[PDB]
Protein backbone atom coordinates (compact mmCIF):
# COMPACT_ATOMS: atom_id res chain seq x y z
CA UNK A 1 0.00 0.00 0.00
CA UNK A 2 1.23 3.46 -0.97
CA UNK A 3 0.64 7.15 -0.28
CA UNK A 4 2.47 9.06 -3.04
CA UNK A 5 2.50 12.51 -1.41
CA UNK A 6 5.79 14.19 -0.51
CA UNK A 7 4.00 16.64 1.78
CA UNK A 8 5.49 18.99 4.36
CA UNK A 9 4.63 19.78 7.98
CA UNK A 10 3.99 23.47 8.58
CA UNK A 11 4.10 23.14 12.36
CA UNK A 12 2.37 26.05 14.10
CA UNK A 13 3.35 27.21 17.58
CA UNK A 14 -0.14 27.30 19.06
CA UNK A 15 1.21 27.39 22.57
CA UNK A 16 1.86 28.72 24.98
CA UNK A 17 4.80 26.36 24.85
CA UNK A 18 3.08 23.36 23.31
CA UNK A 19 3.37 22.91 19.55
CA UNK A 20 0.91 21.70 16.92
CA UNK A 21 1.82 19.92 13.70
CA UNK A 22 -0.45 21.19 10.93
CA UNK A 23 -0.45 20.08 7.29
CA UNK A 24 1.95 22.08 5.12
CA UNK A 25 1.76 21.62 1.35
CA UNK A 26 1.09 18.58 -0.83
CA UNK A 27 3.48 18.02 -3.72
CA UNK A 28 4.61 15.15 -5.94
CA UNK A 29 2.61 12.43 -7.64
CA UNK A 30 -0.91 13.60 -6.85
CA UNK A 31 -2.60 10.20 -7.03
CA UNK A 32 -5.10 8.64 -4.60
CA UNK A 33 -3.51 6.32 -2.08
CA UNK A 34 -4.15 2.68 -2.90
CA UNK A 35 -3.07 -0.90 -2.32
CA UNK A 36 -1.57 -3.44 -4.72
CA UNK A 37 -2.65 -7.07 -4.49
CA UNK A 38 -1.41 -10.04 -6.52
CA UNK A 39 -4.63 -11.12 -8.20
CA UNK A 40 -3.79 -14.72 -9.12
CA UNK A 41 -2.56 -15.26 -5.56
CA UNK A 42 -5.84 -13.97 -4.13
CA UNK A 43 -7.86 -16.15 -6.49
CA UNK A 44 -5.83 -19.22 -5.61
CA UNK A 45 -6.05 -18.74 -1.85
CA UNK A 46 -9.72 -17.80 -1.98
CA UNK A 47 -10.34 -21.09 -3.73
CA UNK A 48 -8.54 -22.94 -0.97
CA UNK A 49 -10.85 -21.20 1.50
CA UNK A 50 -13.93 -22.23 -0.50
CA UNK A 51 -12.77 -25.83 -0.34
CA UNK A 52 -13.24 -25.64 3.41
CA UNK A 53 -16.39 -23.99 3.11
CA UNK B 1 0.20 -9.36 -13.88
CA UNK B 2 -2.48 -9.68 -12.85
CA UNK B 3 -3.03 -7.34 -9.91
CA UNK B 4 -5.79 -5.50 -8.04
CA UNK B 5 -5.85 -1.81 -7.15
CA UNK B 6 -7.73 -0.91 -3.95
CA UNK B 7 -8.79 2.76 -3.56
CA UNK B 8 -7.98 4.12 -0.09
CA UNK B 9 -8.77 7.22 1.95
CA UNK B 10 -6.80 8.97 4.68
CA UNK B 11 -8.22 10.19 7.97
CA UNK B 12 -6.57 12.22 10.71
CA UNK B 13 -9.29 12.06 13.37
CA UNK B 14 -9.88 8.49 14.54
CA UNK B 15 -11.75 6.55 17.25
CA UNK B 16 -10.14 3.44 18.75
CA UNK B 17 -11.92 0.23 19.56
CA UNK B 18 -15.36 1.57 19.01
CA UNK B 19 -14.77 3.84 21.95
CA UNK B 20 -16.74 7.07 22.11
CA UNK B 21 -16.05 9.91 24.53
CA UNK B 22 -12.57 10.62 23.21
CA UNK B 23 -10.60 10.90 19.97
CA UNK B 24 -7.00 11.07 18.79
CA UNK B 25 -5.40 13.31 16.17
CA UNK B 26 -2.78 11.68 13.98
CA UNK B 27 0.02 14.05 13.04
CA UNK B 28 0.68 14.19 9.31
CA UNK B 29 3.75 12.10 8.52
CA UNK B 30 6.23 14.02 6.38
CA UNK B 31 7.22 12.57 3.01
CA UNK B 32 5.98 9.71 0.85
CA UNK B 33 4.57 6.80 2.85
CA UNK B 34 4.61 3.25 1.49
CA UNK B 35 4.70 -0.17 3.16
CA UNK B 36 4.02 -3.87 2.66
CA UNK B 37 2.54 -6.61 4.84
CA UNK B 38 1.27 -10.19 4.97
CA UNK B 39 -2.45 -10.91 4.90
CA UNK B 40 -2.79 -13.94 7.16
CA UNK B 41 -6.53 -14.33 7.60
CA UNK B 42 -10.10 -13.13 7.14
CA UNK B 43 -12.88 -11.91 9.41
CA UNK B 44 -15.97 -13.19 7.61
CA UNK B 45 -19.69 -13.15 8.38
CA UNK B 46 -22.45 -15.43 7.08
Amino acid at each position, epitope marked *: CTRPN*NNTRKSIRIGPGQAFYATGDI*I*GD*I*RQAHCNVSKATWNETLGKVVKQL | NDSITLPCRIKQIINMWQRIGQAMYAPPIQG*VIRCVSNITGLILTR
Partner: antibody
Amino acid sequence: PQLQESGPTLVEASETLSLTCAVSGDSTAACNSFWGWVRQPPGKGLEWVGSLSHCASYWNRGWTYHNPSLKSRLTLALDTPKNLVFLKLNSVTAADTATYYCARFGGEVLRYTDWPKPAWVDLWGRGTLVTV
Amino acid sequence: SALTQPPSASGSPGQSITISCTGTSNNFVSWYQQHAGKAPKLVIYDVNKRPSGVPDRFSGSKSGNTASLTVSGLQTDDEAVYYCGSLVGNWDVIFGGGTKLTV
Protein backbone atom coordinates in the same frame (compact mmCIF):
# COMPACT_ATOMS: atom_id res chain seq x y z
CA PRO C 1 17.51 34.92 -9.36
CA GLN C 2 20.75 34.70 -11.43
CA LEU C 3 22.32 31.87 -13.47
CA GLN C 4 26.05 31.87 -14.52
CA GLU C 5 27.86 29.50 -17.02
CA SER C 6 31.53 28.55 -16.27
CA GLY C 7 34.24 26.21 -17.54
CA PRO C 8 36.76 25.58 -20.34
CA THR C 9 36.20 27.25 -23.77
CA LEU C 10 38.62 24.88 -25.64
CA VAL C 11 38.87 21.07 -25.32
CA GLU C 12 40.63 18.21 -27.26
CA ALA C 13 38.86 15.70 -29.59
CA SER C 14 37.51 12.79 -27.41
CA GLU C 15 38.02 14.76 -24.12
CA THR C 16 35.08 15.01 -21.58
CA LEU C 17 33.60 18.51 -21.25
CA SER C 18 32.92 19.75 -17.67
CA LEU C 19 30.75 22.91 -17.38
CA THR C 20 29.33 24.37 -14.09
CA CYS C 21 26.48 26.84 -13.46
CA ALA C 22 26.55 29.10 -10.39
CA VAL C 23 22.96 29.53 -9.08
CA SER C 24 22.18 32.64 -6.86
CA GLY C 25 18.85 34.06 -5.61
CA ASP C 26 17.14 30.66 -5.11
CA SER C 27 17.95 27.11 -3.88
CA THR C 28 18.65 24.40 -6.44
CA ALA C 29 17.79 21.76 -3.76
CA ALA C 30 14.09 22.97 -3.82
CA CYS C 31 11.28 20.84 -5.41
CA ASN C 32 9.91 23.72 -7.56
CA SER C 33 12.08 22.98 -10.68
CA PHE C 34 14.54 20.89 -12.83
CA TRP C 35 18.01 22.05 -13.75
CA GLY C 36 19.87 21.41 -17.01
CA TRP C 37 21.38 22.59 -20.30
CA VAL C 38 20.59 23.75 -23.89
CA ARG C 39 23.34 24.06 -26.62
CA GLN C 40 22.65 26.31 -29.66
CA PRO C 41 25.08 25.46 -32.56
CA PRO C 42 26.57 28.54 -34.38
CA GLY C 43 24.04 29.83 -36.90
CA LYS C 44 21.50 27.10 -36.02
CA GLY C 45 18.66 26.65 -33.44
CA LEU C 46 18.23 25.44 -29.84
CA GLU C 47 18.92 21.86 -28.73
CA TRP C 48 17.83 20.43 -25.37
CA VAL C 49 20.80 18.71 -23.75
CA GLY C 50 19.22 17.32 -20.56
CA SER C 51 18.00 17.92 -16.96
CA LEU C 52 17.58 16.47 -13.40
CA SER C 53 16.40 17.11 -9.71
CA HIS C 54 17.15 15.47 -6.29
CA CYS C 55 13.44 15.77 -5.25
CA ALA C 56 13.16 11.97 -4.75
CA SER C 57 10.10 9.67 -4.51
CA TYR C 58 9.87 6.40 -2.45
CA TRP C 59 10.99 4.29 -5.50
CA ASN C 60 14.13 6.32 -6.45
CA ARG C 61 16.84 8.86 -5.43
CA GLY C 62 15.65 11.78 -7.65
CA TRP C 63 14.69 12.27 -11.36
CA THR C 64 17.03 12.43 -14.42
CA TYR C 65 15.85 13.19 -18.02
CA HIS C 66 18.38 12.52 -20.87
CA ASN C 67 18.12 13.37 -24.59
CA PRO C 68 17.99 9.79 -26.11
CA SER C 69 20.45 10.79 -28.93
CA LEU C 70 22.95 12.22 -26.41
CA LYS C 71 22.46 9.77 -23.40
CA SER C 72 25.17 7.47 -24.76
CA ARG C 73 27.76 10.17 -23.84
CA LEU C 74 26.14 12.12 -21.03
CA THR C 75 26.29 12.31 -17.17
CA LEU C 76 24.63 15.17 -15.20
CA ALA C 77 25.11 16.36 -11.58
CA LEU C 78 23.97 18.78 -8.83
CA ASP C 79 25.63 20.42 -5.75
CA THR C 80 22.91 21.38 -3.25
CA PRO C 81 25.13 23.06 -0.50
CA LYS C 82 26.84 25.35 -3.09
CA ASN C 83 23.90 25.39 -5.66
CA LEU C 84 25.81 24.24 -8.76
CA VAL C 85 24.66 22.43 -11.98
CA PHE C 86 27.11 20.13 -13.76
CA LEU C 87 27.46 19.02 -17.39
CA LYS C 88 29.67 16.00 -17.96
CA LEU C 89 29.69 15.48 -21.75
CA ASN C 90 31.84 12.44 -22.71
CA SER C 91 34.08 12.10 -25.85
CA VAL C 92 33.63 15.59 -27.38
CA THR C 93 33.85 15.93 -31.18
CA ALA C 94 33.91 18.99 -33.49
CA ALA C 95 30.14 18.34 -34.13
CA ASP C 96 29.61 19.16 -30.40
CA THR C 97 30.78 22.82 -30.83
CA ALA C 98 27.85 25.02 -29.57
CA THR C 99 26.81 27.87 -27.24
CA TYR C 100 25.80 26.12 -24.02
CA TYR C 101 23.09 27.67 -21.71
CA CYS C 102 22.39 27.12 -18.01
CA ALA C 103 18.63 26.41 -17.82
CA ARG C 104 16.07 26.34 -15.01
CA PHE C 105 13.06 24.27 -16.12
CA GLY C 106 9.45 25.21 -15.39
CA GLY C 107 6.38 23.13 -16.26
CA GLU C 108 4.25 20.52 -14.44
CA VAL C 109 7.12 19.88 -11.94
CA LEU C 110 6.27 20.55 -8.17
CA ARG C 111 2.78 18.92 -8.36
CA TYR C 112 2.65 16.25 -11.19
CA THR C 113 0.76 13.13 -12.32
CA ASP C 114 2.56 9.72 -12.67
CA TRP C 115 5.98 11.37 -13.31
CA PRO C 116 7.39 14.98 -13.46
CA LYS C 117 6.71 16.75 -16.80
CA PRO C 118 8.95 19.95 -17.02
CA ALA C 119 8.27 21.89 -20.28
CA TRP C 120 10.09 25.28 -20.46
CA VAL C 121 13.23 27.24 -19.57
CA ASP C 122 11.95 29.17 -16.50
CA LEU C 123 15.27 31.09 -16.10
CA TRP C 124 18.09 31.69 -18.67
CA GLY C 125 21.87 32.19 -18.32
CA ARG C 126 23.83 34.16 -21.00
CA GLY C 127 25.70 31.38 -22.83
CA THR C 128 29.25 30.23 -23.47
CA LEU C 129 30.81 29.04 -26.73
CA VAL C 130 32.79 25.84 -26.30
CA THR C 131 34.88 24.53 -29.22
CA VAL C 132 37.55 21.81 -30.02
CA SER D 1 8.78 13.93 -34.71
CA ALA D 2 9.82 17.64 -34.56
CA LEU D 3 8.43 21.19 -34.60
CA THR D 4 8.30 23.15 -37.86
CA GLN D 5 8.74 26.94 -38.21
CA PRO D 6 9.04 28.86 -41.57
CA PRO D 7 12.40 30.72 -41.80
CA SER D 8 11.16 34.38 -41.59
CA ALA D 9 8.35 37.13 -40.67
CA SER D 10 7.54 40.74 -41.87
CA GLY D 11 5.29 43.85 -41.60
CA SER D 12 5.56 47.62 -40.78
CA PRO D 13 5.18 49.15 -37.22
CA GLY D 14 1.62 48.97 -35.86
CA GLN D 15 0.95 45.75 -37.80
CA SER D 16 0.26 42.21 -36.43
CA ILE D 17 1.83 38.87 -37.39
CA THR D 18 0.64 35.35 -36.54
CA ILE D 19 3.41 32.72 -36.70
CA SER D 20 2.75 28.90 -36.91
CA CYS D 21 4.44 25.88 -35.13
CA THR D 22 3.65 22.37 -36.67
CA GLY D 23 4.18 19.23 -34.52
CA THR D 24 1.04 19.01 -32.30
CA SER D 25 0.33 19.09 -28.52
CA ASN D 26 -0.60 18.80 -25.44
CA ASN D 27 -0.89 21.92 -23.28
CA PHE D 28 2.96 21.93 -22.93
CA VAL D 29 3.57 24.73 -25.50
CA SER D 30 5.89 27.76 -25.20
CA TRP D 31 7.59 30.50 -27.32
CA TYR D 32 10.97 32.29 -26.95
CA GLN D 33 12.46 35.56 -28.23
CA GLN D 34 16.13 35.92 -29.23
CA HIS D 35 18.13 38.94 -30.26
CA ALA D 36 21.51 38.77 -32.02
CA GLY D 37 24.29 38.30 -29.47
CA LYS D 38 21.61 37.63 -26.78
CA ALA D 39 20.20 34.56 -24.90
CA PRO D 40 16.50 33.56 -25.68
CA LYS D 41 13.74 35.04 -23.40
CA LEU D 42 10.55 33.11 -22.45
CA VAL D 43 7.61 34.97 -24.15
CA ILE D 44 4.70 32.52 -23.39
CA TYR D 45 3.94 29.05 -21.85
CA ASP D 46 0.71 26.87 -21.30
CA VAL D 47 -0.36 28.19 -24.73
CA ASN D 48 -2.13 31.27 -23.22
CA LYS D 49 0.16 32.32 -20.29
CA ARG D 50 2.56 35.34 -20.20
CA PRO D 51 5.26 35.49 -17.50
CA SER D 52 5.78 38.81 -15.59
CA GLY D 53 6.96 41.58 -17.91
CA VAL D 54 5.85 40.23 -21.28
CA PRO D 55 3.60 42.96 -22.88
CA ASP D 56 -0.19 42.45 -23.19
CA ARG D 57 0.07 42.64 -27.03
CA PHE D 58 1.77 39.20 -27.20
CA SER D 59 -0.54 36.10 -27.38
CA GLY D 60 -0.81 32.58 -28.89
CA SER D 61 -3.20 29.66 -29.37
CA LYS D 62 -3.36 26.16 -31.00
CA SER D 63 -5.46 23.81 -33.19
CA GLY D 64 -4.81 20.24 -34.20
CA ASN D 65 -1.16 19.80 -35.23
CA THR D 66 -0.27 23.52 -35.21
CA ALA D 67 0.27 26.18 -32.53
CA SER D 68 0.57 29.92 -33.14
CA LEU D 69 1.86 33.12 -31.59
CA THR D 70 0.41 36.51 -32.58
CA VAL D 71 2.48 39.72 -31.98
CA SER D 72 0.35 42.85 -32.38
CA GLY D 73 1.50 46.48 -32.63
CA LEU D 74 4.93 45.93 -34.20
CA GLN D 75 7.95 48.12 -33.33
CA THR D 76 11.77 48.23 -33.80
CA ASP D 77 12.56 46.06 -30.69
CA ASP D 78 10.23 43.26 -31.90
CA GLU D 79 12.80 42.19 -34.57
CA ALA D 80 14.30 38.97 -33.23
CA VAL D 81 14.39 35.18 -33.90
CA TYR D 82 11.46 33.33 -32.32
CA TYR D 83 11.25 29.66 -31.29
CA CYS D 84 8.26 27.51 -30.25
CA GLY D 85 8.73 24.57 -27.78
CA SER D 86 6.80 21.33 -26.98
CA LEU D 87 7.02 18.46 -24.45
CA VAL D 88 6.91 15.12 -26.33
CA GLY D 89 6.24 11.51 -25.33
CA ASN D 90 7.67 11.33 -21.84
CA TRP D 91 9.99 14.29 -21.30
CA ASP D 92 11.40 15.10 -24.76
CA VAL D 93 11.91 18.90 -25.08
CA ILE D 94 11.53 19.95 -28.81
CA PHE D 95 12.42 23.32 -30.29
CA GLY D 96 11.27 24.53 -33.73
CA GLY D 97 13.62 25.66 -36.49
CA GLY D 98 13.03 29.30 -35.60
CA THR D 99 11.35 32.21 -37.47
CA LYS D 100 13.33 35.47 -37.79
CA LEU D 101 10.83 38.40 -37.62
CA THR D 102 11.60 41.89 -39.07
CA VAL D 103 9.68 45.13 -38.53
